[PDB]
Design a protein around this nucleic acid. Sequence first.
DNA 1: AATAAGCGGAAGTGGG
DNA 2: TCCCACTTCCGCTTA
Length: 91
Amino acid sequence: KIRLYQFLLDLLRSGDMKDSIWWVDKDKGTFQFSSKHKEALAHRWGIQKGNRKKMTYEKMARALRNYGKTGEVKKVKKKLTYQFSGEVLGR
DNA sequence: AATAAGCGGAAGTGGG
DNA sequence: TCCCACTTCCGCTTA
Ligand code: NA
Ligand code: NA
């Protein structure tokens, strides 16, 4: 099954949830979630994964924080903003 | 207070 | 056995 960072990168490339997520600086790999429309994107992640419970942004962001140590995604000190690593972007 | 983003320890689930 | 890659739950902090 697809990994969360790849799910997000695929959405950003396809543009299918443009009102929920967007690039801030695609060259740097920085992206930002919609304050009002992030939950619809979280819901789609959980359904794609076939999880038992409804997915929420809180739980999705709990998973995102676990990438901080390995580096695929880092939190940026801006509201709802994160950054993919160069390695993730290159693939 | 009400709302919201952010945090992470701990334990549970999946598929190796 | 025991790690993967999250998921779920809970309590806390800051604005
Ligand atoms: Na967040
Ligand atoms: Na929030």
